[PDB]
C-alpha cells in the first residue's frame, strides 16, 4: 500500500 | 458469525480532548507537519521534534483525558466477537487500550512508545525523551525517536491488516478523514473482497457507493448506536 502519505 | 474489521482515525478521539494528529492545511493544529511529522523534520531539528512529541506525550496522560463512549463501544464489540474482530487505528493515543481493546494494530505507531533509530526496536516510554536517553538493544547505544510513523515512512502491521481486509465480512471506518493513505484506501480493498462497508464519521470522507452504509454525527453518539444495533443483530 505504499508509505504514509496525504491527499 | 461475521468477521469485522474496524479502522479508526483522529475523529474518534476528538471528543476526548486530544490535541490532534489530524492534518489540516499542512498543520497539526499549530505545527507544520513538514516540521514535526516527517523524517526530514526530525533530521533538521530533532530537539524541536522531541519537544513536540514530549509535549503530546504529556498531554495524553493528563487526568482530563478519558476514553469516550465511542472507544467503550468498540471494546464491547471486541468482547462479543473475539478473534472475529480486529481494530486498526491510525491514532497514536492509547484510548482504545484504556477502553479495554486488545491487540490494537497501531498502523501509525504509538505516542507512549519510543524506538531505537537504528534497531527499530520499540519500547514502552511514558516520560520525556532527552538527548541522554539512548537504546539498550545495540552495540553502541543510539538516539531514541518517537515510535510514531511520519509521512513518508511505511506504516506498521500492513501484512496483518491486508490479510484481515481480504477476510472481513464487515469493514467499518470511524473518524477518518479520507486524506491519509494507505489507510483511506482500505475501504476499497474491503469492497473488492465483498465486505459490507460502513462509515461512521462527523463528516463524509468519500463521495459515493464505496461505503455501503454511512451515519454522520459526533463519534460518541453515532458509534455506540451502530455497535449496539450490530450487537443485537447477533442475538
Ligand atoms: Zn539500538
Amino acid at each position: 500500500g505504499g508509505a504514509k502519505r496525504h491527499r | 458469525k461475521p468477521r469485522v474489521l474496524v479502522l479508526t482515525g483522529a475523529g474518534i478521539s476528538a471528543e476526548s480532548g486530544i490535541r490532534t494528529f489530524r492534518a489540516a492545511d499542512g498543520l497539526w493544529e499549530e505545527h507544520r507537519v513538514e516540521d514535526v511529522g516527517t523524517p526530514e523534520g526530525f533530521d533538521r531539528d530533532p530537539e524541536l521534534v522531541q519537544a513536540f512529541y514530549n509535549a503530546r506525550r504529556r498531554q495524553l496522560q493528563q487526568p482530563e483525558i478519558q476514553p469516550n463512549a465511542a472507544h467503550l463501544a468498540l471494546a464491547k464489540l471486541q468482547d462479543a466477537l473475539g478473534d472475529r474482530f480486529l481494530l486498526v487505528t491510525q491514532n497514536c493515543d492509547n484510548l482504545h487500550e484504556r477502553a479495554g481493546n486488545t491487540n490494537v494494530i497501531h498502523m501509525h505507531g504509538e505516542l507512549l512508545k519510543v524506538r531505537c533509530s537504528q534497531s527499530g526496536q520499540a519500547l514502552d516510554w511514558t516520560g520525556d525523551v532527552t538527548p541522554e536517553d539512548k537504546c539498550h538493544c545495540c552495540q553502541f547505544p543510539a538516539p531514541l525517536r518517537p515510535h510514531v510513523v511520519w509521512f513518508g515512512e511505511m506504516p506498521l502491521g500492513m501484512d496483518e491488516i491486508y490479510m484481515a481486509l481480504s477476510m472481513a465480512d464487515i469493514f467499518i471506518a470511524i473518524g477518518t478523514s479520507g486524506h491519509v493513505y494507505p489507510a483511506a484506501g482500505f475501504v476499497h480493498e474491503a469492497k473488492l473482497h465483498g465486505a459490507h462497508t460502513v462509515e461512521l464519521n462527523l463528516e463524509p470522507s468519500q463521495v459515493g457507493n464505496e461505503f455501503a452504509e454511512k451515519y454522520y454525527g459526533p463519534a460518541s453518539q453515532v458509534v455506540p448506536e451502530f455497535v449496539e444495533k450490530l450487537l443485537k443483530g447477533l442475538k
Side-chain angles (χ1 to χ4, degrees):
Chain A
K4 186 184 179 176
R5 62 195 181 271
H6 199 270
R7 293 154 230 168
Chain B
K1 271 205 204 166
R3 292 182 75 76
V4 175
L5 186 158
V6 175
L7 167 74
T8 64
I12 198 178
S13 291
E15 292 169 272
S16 293
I18 287 293
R19 291 169 193 274
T20 194
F21 285 83
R22 184 112 76 188
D25 298 332
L27 289 175
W28 271 347
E29 294 179 349
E30 54 175 301
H31 292 90
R32 286 287 182 206
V33 177
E34 255 288 337
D35 296 328
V36 297
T38 69
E40 288 62 64
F42 183 70
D43 286 339
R44 282 185 245 106
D45 198 347
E47 170 196 45
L48 180 141
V49 178
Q50 296 283 21
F52 170 84
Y53 285 98
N54 283 346
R56 294 300 79 70
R57 198 177 301 105
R58 294 190 301 270
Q59 181 250 1
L60 172 58
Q61 311 177 76
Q62 294 308 318
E64 55 270 28
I65 304 299
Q66 297 287 125
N68 58 62
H71 296 108
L72 303 182
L74 295 177
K76 297 188 187 178
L77 186 55
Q78 183 170 32
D79 283 345
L81 293 176
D83 285 9
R84 291 189 303 273
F85 169 96
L86 180 68
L87 173 62
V88 181
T89 190
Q90 305 171 220
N91 300 337
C92 60
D93 65 55
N94 65 335
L95 300 181
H96 287 307
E97 286 80 5
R98 290 178 56 192
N101 280 111
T102 63
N103 190 24
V104 178
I105 303 181
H106 286 263
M107 67 180 289
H108 297 160
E110 299 172 69
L111 205 43
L112 299 175
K113 288 182 177 176
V114 294
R115 187 196 310 170
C116 168
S117 60
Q118 86 169 344
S119 144
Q121 283 172 33
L123 56 87
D124 294 304
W125 194 280
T126 54
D128 289 351
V129 177
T130 65
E132 299 86 4
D133 292 308
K134 283 175 178 66
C135 77
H136 304 293
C137 50
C138 299
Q139 183 63 55
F140 298 160
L144 296 169
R145 58 160 278 177
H147 190 52
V148 172
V149 173
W150 293 325
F151 285 92
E153 303 183 321
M154 304 298 301
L156 309 172
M158 299 297 292
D159 293 336
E160 185 175 354
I161 290 166
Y162 278 119
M163 285 187 325
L165 277 166
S166 69
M167 295 293 159
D169 298 309
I170 303 170
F171 170 77
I172 312 168
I174 308 170
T176 71
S177 75
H179 295 101
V180 178
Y181 288 79
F186 289 169
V187 56
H188 179 70
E189 185 80 1
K191 179 181 299 295
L192 271 38
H193 291 91
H196 175 62
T197 54
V198 181
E199 176 170 36
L200 312 174
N201 222 328
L202 184 57
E203 309 194 45
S205 63
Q206 103 293 6
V207 149
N209 302 177
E210 43 284 28
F211 284 102
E213 184 177 6
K214 333 163 198 291
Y215 303 99
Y216 300 104
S220 60
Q221 303 198 106
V222 169
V223 176
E225 260 145 32
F226 182 80
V227 166
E228 289 186 21
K229 173 164 172 183
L230 193 54
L231 289 185
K232 292 171 175 145
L234 295 216
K235 317 159 110 132

